[PDB]
Amino acid sequence: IQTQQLHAAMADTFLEHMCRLDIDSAPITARNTGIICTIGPASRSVETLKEMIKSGMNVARMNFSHGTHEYHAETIKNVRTATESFASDPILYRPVAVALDTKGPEIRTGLIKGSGTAEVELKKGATLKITLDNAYMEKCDENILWLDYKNICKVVDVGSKVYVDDGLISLQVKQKGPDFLVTEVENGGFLGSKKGVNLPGAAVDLPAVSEKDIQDLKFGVEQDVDMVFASFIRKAADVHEVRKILGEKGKNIKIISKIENHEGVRRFDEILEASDGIMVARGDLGIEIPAEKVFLAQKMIIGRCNRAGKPVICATQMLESMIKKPRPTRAEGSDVANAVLDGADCIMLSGETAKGDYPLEAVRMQHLIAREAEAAMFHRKLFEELARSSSHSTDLMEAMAMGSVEASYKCLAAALIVLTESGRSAHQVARYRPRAPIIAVTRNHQTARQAHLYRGIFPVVCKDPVQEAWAEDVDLRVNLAMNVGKARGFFKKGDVVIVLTGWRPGSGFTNTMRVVPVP
């Protein structure tokens, strides 16, 4: 029986491709979908980290919706420690990135009847009034509700909706005043103190960045974070703002715009153009838009990204049941397989590794489903479809990407080796979806850390100094990749590999391509 789901790879049609999927067809050793683990209490310890680093973790995410700089600084400190506990061997040394997950702008309610531990009960078809009179700031009750969003009137209109405490409570504006609104509880419940407000369908004035956001980004630039996951991105203008805050010191830091509402969606094109990657925040998204429409947003966002060659991340509730159990639901395993299939660059674990009882087991599972799904894609058709979208482009590095990938399918290469410092060269390739692993060999650490954002890229860091001669230095870097691949089980000695490099030092892109056999 044929491995790596090859026989399906020859289907002339999509139905036939499906029809040939065989569970007896072994996947390969290598996994291309990156895994982004949320770090916290259950995964914060160093030792835990080493293991998680061992299970398949590639990116440590830091959620700044909480914790103090001191906390994070510590978390961050362990990662690095764990991470580096392996550099002793440049071969078995796997880099790990670091993400700053911005808390961002919010809308909150006042104090209920003065207490912070109080509740009011809101019933269906009830008249609840919302005001901006600073007085009620601590006197919110069931007839009067006070907000912390000055412009709430300008942005909403008659008949719009408000969602208190995260979707739970909903209200329809049945009267529009200048500093108050008159809502009708529609789908009510229990209301508490300082709960989140959502205005689906609206065009929120709210600044790109919160005051807290700022000390958080600064703190990231200081901590040398590889990237930033930016909240509630609504337009391109918003992206420029974080871009500004990062300043010149963190111009290298990647900005991953997070899609959280109607706007982000309806203006996705302008956001993609300005972002460095994109995030499908299924979670917050699911609150702002109807849950049945989430899958729409997720596929469109992914296609669009795939099509444009910008990494896209699928997040939240992937393996949820697993925070408390050792095994995921059938829907969970299917959520994961499909994400990849949709073409996600990388998938993520929130609660699962942050709070959960089975963080390792959660990593391993994602590691597992991904490989299986990665082999069940339809390379031949995706590739064409992809190429046709980029026909308008005659870039040279693209041309080398395309030709390199085609060759990789033709002769069944075991891998694709790429020497690069920026990473663009490898990014270009990944963008084309080889089926085999793209082993990128860089001397720039950061470059190796941010490479994970791409599908297929397995970054290898070269610690050796620059040789006198390009040929030799080029041949050294290559051997490195070959040793690493041989040890990690990606390939044997008779395998065929595709190699991309620069003809001469300082060439511009890998403009050279050879078919070389594993020594």
State the Cα–Cα distance between residues 379 and 456, nearest whole angstrom. Answer: 13
Annotated binding-site residue? 350: no
Annotated binding-site residue? 420: yes
CB 279 within 8 A of CB 258: yes
- Among the candidate windows 1-9, 282-290, 373-381, 412-420, which touches ligand PEQ by CB under 6 A? 282-290
Q: Lay out the site mask for its own copies across 259-298 (x = CB under 8 A, - = otherwise).
A: ---x--xx---------------xx--x--xxxxxxxxxx
- What part of residues 38-67 is at the interface with ligand PEQ (CB under 6 A)? 63, 65
Q: Lay out the site mask for K ion across 455-494 (x = CB under 5 A, - = otherwise).
A: ----------------------------------------
- Among the candidate windows 43-51, 276-284, 394-402, 487-495, which touches ligand PEQ by CB under 6 A? 276-284
Collapsing DSSP states into helix, strand and coil, what is residue 97?
strand
Whether 218 is catalytic is no
Collapsing DSSP states into helix, strand and coil, what is residue 169?
strand
- Residue (251 or 330) nearer to its own copies, CB: 330
Where helices occur in 95-210 by DSSP H, the ranges are 152-155
**What would the two tokens of residue 124 be?**
């269906």
How far CA 394 is from CA of 385, 387, 397, 400, 512, in Å, comes to 16, 11, 9, 11, 17
**By CB under 8 A, residue 23 contacts its own copies:** yes
Number of other CB atoms surrounding residue 120 within 10 Å:
16
CA-based Rg of the chain, rounded to a whole angstrom? 25
| 273 φ/ψ angles, rounded to the nearest 5 degrees | -60, -35
**What would the two tokens of residue 370 be?**
């991904």
State the Cα–Cα distance between residues 129 and 178, nearest whole angstrom. Answer: 13
Min separation Cβ 458 and its own copies, Å: 20
**Which residues lie closer than 8 Å to 23 by C-beta, 6 or more apart?**
none
Tokens 């429409």 appear where? 293
Which one of 68, 159, 248, 330 is in contact with its own copies (CB under 8 A)? 330
- Residue (29 or 65) nearer to ligand PEQ, CB: 65
**By CB under 8 A, residue 469 contacts its own copies:** no
Whether 447 is catalytic is no
**By CB under 8 A, residue 90 contacts its own copies:** no
Q: Lay out the site mask for K ion across 93-132 (x = CB under 5 A, - = otherwise).
A: --------x-x-----------------------------
Which one of 260, 276, 345, 374 is in contact with ligand PEQ (CB under 6 A)? 260
**What would the two tokens of residue 230 be?**
């930016």
- Residue (51 or 166) nearer to K ion, CB: 166
- Among the candidate windows 82-90, 242-250, 281-289, 491-499, which touches ligand PEQ by CB under 6 A? 281-289
State the Cα–Cα distance between residues 297 and 88, nearest whole angstrom. Answer: 44
- What part of residues 75-114 is at the interface with ligand PEQ (CB under 6 A)? 101
Q: Which of 31, 38, 48, 61 is catalytic?
A: 61
Annotated binding-site residue? 284: yes
H or E element: which one contains 285?
A: helix 282-288
Burial 425-461 (b: 16+ CB within 10 A, else e): bbbbbbbbbbbbbbbbbbbeebbbbbbbbbbbbbbbb
**By CB under 5 A, residue 284 contacts Mg ion:** yes
How far CA 19 is from CA of 334, 338, 360, 373, 519, in Å, comes to 17, 16, 33, 15, 38
Whether 108 is catalytic is yes
Name the binder of 258 from its own copies, ligand PEQ, K ion, none, CB < 5-8 A by kind: ligand PEQ
**By CB under 5 A, residue 238 contacts Mg ion:** no
Binding site for Mg ion (CB under 5 A): 260, 281, 284
Active site amino acids = 61, 108, 258, 316
Binding site for ligand PEQ (CB under 6 A): 63, 65, 101, 231, 258, 260, 281-284, 315-316, 350
